[PDB]
Scaffold this active site. Structure first.
Site, PDB file in Angstrom:
ATOM      1  N   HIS B  41       0.803  -1.222   0.000  1.00 19.49           N
ATOM      2  CA  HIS B  41       0.000   0.000   0.000  1.00 19.49           C
ATOM      3  C   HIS B  41       0.844   1.284   0.000  1.00 19.49           C
ATOM      4  CE1 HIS B  41       0.200   1.241   4.252  1.00 19.49           C
ATOM      5  NE2 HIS B  41      -0.118   0.011   4.657  1.00 19.49           N
ATOM      6  N   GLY B 135       2.470   6.100  10.381  1.00 16.82           N
ATOM      7  CA  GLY B 135       3.892   5.989  10.063  1.00 16.82           C
ATOM      8  C   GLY B 135       4.520   4.679  10.524  1.00 16.82           C
ATOM      9  N   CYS B 137       3.467   1.623   9.729  1.00 16.65           N
ATOM     10  CA  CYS B 137       3.333   0.569   8.704  1.00 16.65           C
ATOM     11  C   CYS B 137       4.688   0.042   8.246  1.00 16.65           C
ATOM     12  CB  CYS B 137       2.495   1.049   7.523  1.00 16.65           C
ATOM     13  SG  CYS B 137       0.769   1.435   7.940  1.00 16.65           S
TER      14      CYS B 137
HETATM   15  C1  LIG Z   1      -4.470   5.309   4.142  1.00 16.56           C
HETATM   16  S1  LIG Z   1      -6.165   5.051   3.776  1.00 16.56           S
HETATM   17  O1  LIG Z   1      -6.251   4.079   2.730  1.00 16.56           O
HETATM   18  O2  LIG Z   1      -6.776   6.329   3.576  1.00 16.56           O
HETATM   19  N1  LIG Z   1      -6.858   4.397   5.087  1.00 16.56           N
HETATM   20  C2  LIG Z   1      -6.126   3.750   6.188  1.00 16.56           C
HETATM   21  C3  LIG Z   1      -5.549   2.405   5.806  1.00 16.56           C
HETATM   22  C4  LIG Z   1      -6.303   1.495   5.067  1.00 16.56           C
HETATM   23  C5  LIG Z   1      -5.757   0.302   4.629  1.00 16.56           C
HETATM   24  C6  LIG Z   1      -4.445   0.022   4.927  1.00 16.56           C
HETATM   25 CL1  LIG Z   1      -3.729  -1.451   4.334  1.00 16.56          CL
HETATM   26  C7  LIG Z   1      -3.673   0.889   5.675  1.00 16.56           C
HETATM   27  C8  LIG Z   1      -4.217   2.087   6.134  1.00 16.56           C
HETATM   28  C9  LIG Z   1      -3.347   3.001   6.969  1.00 16.56           C
HETATM   29  C10 LIG Z   1      -3.375   2.548   8.417  1.00 16.56           C
HETATM   30  O3  LIG Z   1      -4.274   1.836   8.860  1.00 16.56           O
HETATM   31  N2  LIG Z   1      -2.347   3.007   9.160  1.00 16.56           N
HETATM   32  C11 LIG Z   1      -2.146   2.888  10.551  1.00 16.56           C
HETATM   33  C12 LIG Z   1      -1.531   1.796  11.163  1.00 16.56           C
HETATM   34  N3  LIG Z   1      -1.337   1.662  12.482  1.00 16.56           N
HETATM   35  C13 LIG Z   1      -1.755   2.646  13.267  1.00 16.56           C
HETATM   36  C14 LIG Z   1      -2.404   3.815  12.800  1.00 16.56           C
HETATM   37  C15 LIG Z   1      -2.882   4.834  13.662  1.00 16.56           C
HETATM   38  C16 LIG Z   1      -3.532   5.924  13.155  1.00 16.56           C
HETATM   39  C17 LIG Z   1      -3.733   6.055  11.786  1.00 16.56           C
HETATM   40  C18 LIG Z   1      -3.287   5.096  10.921  1.00 16.56           C
HETATM   41  C19 LIG Z   1      -2.609   3.943  11.398  1.00 16.56           C
END
Ligand SMILES: CS(=O)(=O)NCc1ccc(Cl)cc1CC(=O)Nc1cncc2ccccc12
Ligand SMILES: CS(=O)(=O)NCc1ccc(Cl)cc1CC(=O)Nc1cncc2ccccc12
Ligand SMILES: [Cl-]
EC number: 3.4.19.12
Lengths: 305, 297
Positions: B41, B135, B137
């Site tokens: 991603h 951040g 990930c």
């Molecule tokens: C980036 S997006 O596609 O708009 N939606 C989020 C998302 C969907 C699908 C995927 Cl595979 C990954 C994401 C980004 C994601 O989940 N990050 C996070 C990981 N760990 C802690 C976090 C804490 C607060 C915010 C984000 C965090």
């Protein structure tokens, strides 16, 4: 999101762990530049421990009586000196893995990571706090002496603890890296007991602010308290007194969540009175005191949920 | 004495963490030999998004050095970036897929820089109760067996309940999750029974015996009771695995099961076990034996 008891990455400390042997005793040492630091009780037998005269035991030793092993390499000891309860062994090789470091003496309530070691080999890393009674509730077995406590804020390792002994209650006592013990303890097998321990109040409050940041408020109430009234109540539950320094230190967490320190104190008073009633706070059914205000700011988001 | 949630020493993994940037997205990568592994991603139709990227679109930073990407490919939900330089700090390693109930250490990273290490377990619902911010990930989970690092987890996302989801290092998700913004929720979780029993044995080894009783139970009766409290079923394999701890303490596994039944039906009555007022399920039988024996790496 989430809140874990988080330790610092231990790699910078792993590269400093060595094995120190003197006769039949083997323990851990910390190799920084051309010096190996270890508990002075490495020169003792079990009989010696009742009333050891370290100056008399040390004068009978030469450099070649100390065996220092770093990985599979034997280091040569070219000098030795005692500083308080620490033995400093000058070696002929500077540690190429020496990180940027400082020796810092911490106060009760401060937290740190412990890299538990056996035979100069790291086995695990955990987070803990210097208790108000100056002991640490560690996880240590025989051979762990010389294992160290540290913090790594930025790229510099601040060494704050070296392990020396386990007390009869299963808790642990040790020194700073200059060999001064934390607490009224001695590196001697004598009637030594930890004083009655208390809860680190400023840390419980920090952890309550952490729960608010992560989105939980069930424990808050409509009340406030004076600092003196809070302390009169807190001391009945074996909680450490909260000082004006602690109130000042909680200022940033108070501004981030919008909850005044004395209002969070009122919530703590009520939790002490009522218990949790089947609820948890950050996955715990007890009030957690091993996270400082600084740890909460480091781990938690800057934006409250 | 003592019993802490102990992680493996993280140094061997710290030497593999890098920062991967693609356009506006920055996350963590794992640099092993001449390949950097990271969540796909970082770049949806992933094949279509990937075909539009060249090697130079991926910026990989290892400490203060920029690595040159010379190839790229996708394996399930992981992106593999071939770099010109092999990591001189590559430890002996394996990619292993773990099962629910198994534990591992997580080295949480931001901008390719390790910030903390903690221990956790793969929940029965395939999520992990981690501690991650934006951040994080690409941060990885691992165990160390002798001098070999077994990488078992790579962080991909946080779910609405604050729990986390990710993949093994071959890019296969743990759980029914997908890498995209859509309605996804963790299933109802259960307690890891074999782990609670292991932790009860750790408490006994440490001098906490107030919960022991004279009773025993059958495996079937214990499972009927355990099912009522959202506890995972205990199998004969779990009973066999607890054999060594049973011989060390002198308490038969079904004897400890009868203690667990009484704790579920009556509570702790104001008492704690190893400083906890809840029954802890994130220590495996092997973790208990290792922490109560001093195994080094
Ligand atoms: C980036 S997006 O596609 O708009 N939606 C989020 C998302 C969907 C699908 C995927 Cl595979 C990954 C994401 C980004 C994601 O989940 N990050 C996070 C990981 N760990 C802690 C976090 C804490 C607060 C915010 C984000 C965090
Ligand atoms: C040799 S003795 O007089 O019997 N007492 C040992 C002793 C006295 C005084 C001092 Cl400063 C140090 C020791 C050694 C010592 O306490 N080791 C240990 C450290 N940490 C955890 C332990 C767990 C189990 C067994 C030993 C442990
Ligand atoms: Cl301090």
């Amino acid at each position: 999101s989430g809140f874990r008891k988080m330790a610092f990455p231990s790699g910078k400390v792993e590269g400093c762990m060595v094995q120190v042997t003197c006769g039949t005793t083997t323990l851990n040492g910390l190799w920084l530049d051309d010096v190996v630091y270890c508990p002075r009780h490495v020169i003792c037998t079990s009989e010696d421990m009742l009333n050891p005269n370290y100056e008399d035991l040390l004068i009978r030793k030469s450099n070649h009586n100390f065996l220092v092993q770093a990985g599979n390499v034997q280091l040569r000891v070219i000098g030795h000196s005692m500083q308080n309860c620490v033995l400093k062994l000058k070696v002929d090789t500077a540690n190429p893995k020496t990180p940027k470091y400082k020796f810092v003496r911490i106060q009760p309530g401060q937290t740190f990571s412990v890299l538990a070691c056996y035979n100069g080999s790291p086995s695990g890393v955990y987070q803990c706090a210097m208790r108000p009674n100056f002991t640490i509730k560690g996880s240590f077995l025989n051979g762990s002496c010389g294992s160290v406590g540290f913090n790594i804020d930025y790229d510099c390792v601040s060494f704050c603890y070296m392990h020396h002994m386990e007390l009869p209650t299963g808790v642990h006592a040790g020194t700073d890296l200059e060999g001064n013990f934390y607490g009224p303890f001695v590196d001697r097998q004598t009637a030594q007991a930890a004083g009655t321990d208390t809860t680190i109040t400023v840390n419980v409050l920090a952890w309550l602010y952490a729960a608010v940041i992560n989105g939980d408020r069930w424990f808050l109430n409509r009340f406030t308290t004076t600092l003196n009234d809070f302390n009169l109540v807190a001391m009945k539950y074996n909680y450490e007194p909260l000082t004006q320094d602690h109130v000042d230190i909680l200022g940033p967490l108070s501004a981030q969540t919008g909850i005044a320190v004395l209002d969070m104190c009122a919530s703590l008073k009520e939790l002490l009175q009522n218990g949790m009633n089947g609820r948890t706070i950050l996955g715990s059914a007890l009030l957690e005191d091993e996270f400082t205000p600084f740890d909460v700011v480091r781990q938690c988001s800057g934006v409250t949920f």
